[PDB]
Amino acid sequence: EVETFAFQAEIAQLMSLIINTFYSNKEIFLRELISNSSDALDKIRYESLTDPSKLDSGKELHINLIPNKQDRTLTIVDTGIGMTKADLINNLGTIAKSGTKAFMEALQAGADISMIGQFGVGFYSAYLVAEKVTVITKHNDDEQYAWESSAGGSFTVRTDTGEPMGRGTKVILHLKEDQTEYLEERRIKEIVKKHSQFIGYPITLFVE
Ligand SMILES: CCc1cc(-n2c(=O)[nH]c3ccccc32)c(O)cc1O
Numbered sequence: 001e002v003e004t005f006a007f008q009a010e011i012a013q014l015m016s017l018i019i020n021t022f023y024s025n026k027e028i029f030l031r032e033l034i035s036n037s038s039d040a041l042d043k044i045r046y047e048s049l050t051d052p053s054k055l056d057s058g059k060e061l062h063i064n065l066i067p068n069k070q071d072r073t074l075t076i077v078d079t080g081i082g083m084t085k086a087d088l089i090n091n092l093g094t095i096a097k098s099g100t101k102a103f104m105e106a107l108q109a110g111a112d113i114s115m116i117g118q119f120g121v122g123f124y125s126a127y128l129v130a131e132k133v134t135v136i137t138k139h140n141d142d143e144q145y146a147w148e149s150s151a152g153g154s155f156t157v158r159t160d161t162g163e164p165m166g167r168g169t170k171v172i173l174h175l176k177e178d179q180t181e182y183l184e185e186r187r188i189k190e191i192v193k194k195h196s197q198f199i200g201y202p203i204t205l206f207v208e
Pocket residue numbers: 033036037039040041043078080081082083092093123137168169171
């Protein structure tokens with residue numbers, strides 16, 4: 001059973017802007033996803049200080065970067081707090097409507113696409129490099145779900161019976177054909193060192 005939803009008009013406009021605007025500095029998508037993972041890991045870390053049982057679904061707090069040249073995918077996995085089905089549907093836990101408004105007003109006032117994360121909609125920068133994005137998530141208070149969108153104004157949500165995660169979020173980027181550099185080990189290492197060198201959680205870059 002797959003449910004299909006329409007993006008609110010402001011998010012469909014944001015996604016169209018990210019896909020159609022000429023902007024060469026696409027590598028910032030990785031910083032934005034690692035930053036979101038770090039925020040999720042901070043939240044489960046803080047919650048676990050008063051309720052240690054919230055770590056029964058996994059004590060390790062980390063981020064994995066998994067390239068797959070055969071599938072042309074780059075996957076970002078974290079063991080953060082995860083998202084409920086309600087959070088996924090409500091713009092993946094972001095203030096996307098007001099955030100898109102503030103980002104649009106900033107772009108007219110001198111800001112560029114790399115500042116997207118300051119408006120809480122950094123997730124959508126995944127569409128700088130991906131034709132399709134799959135978000136697999138498991139929160140302690142809900143079941144495992146898969147969100148998916150190739151943009152075009154709609155997204156889907158389904159239960160995920162594939163590999164149980166325990167807790168956290170998995171972002172699968174189905175890369176555009178001219179964006180395969182983001183599957184190269186030396187290129188990922190370079191971007192992590194440039195933009196995410198001081199993240200408070202281990203970042204493991206998987207090899208093939
Ligand atoms: C949709 C953006 C995104 C969101 C999350 N995320 C969650 O899954 N829970 C979060 C709680 C606070 C902040 C971000 C969170 C993540 O772990 C990775 C991501 O790329």
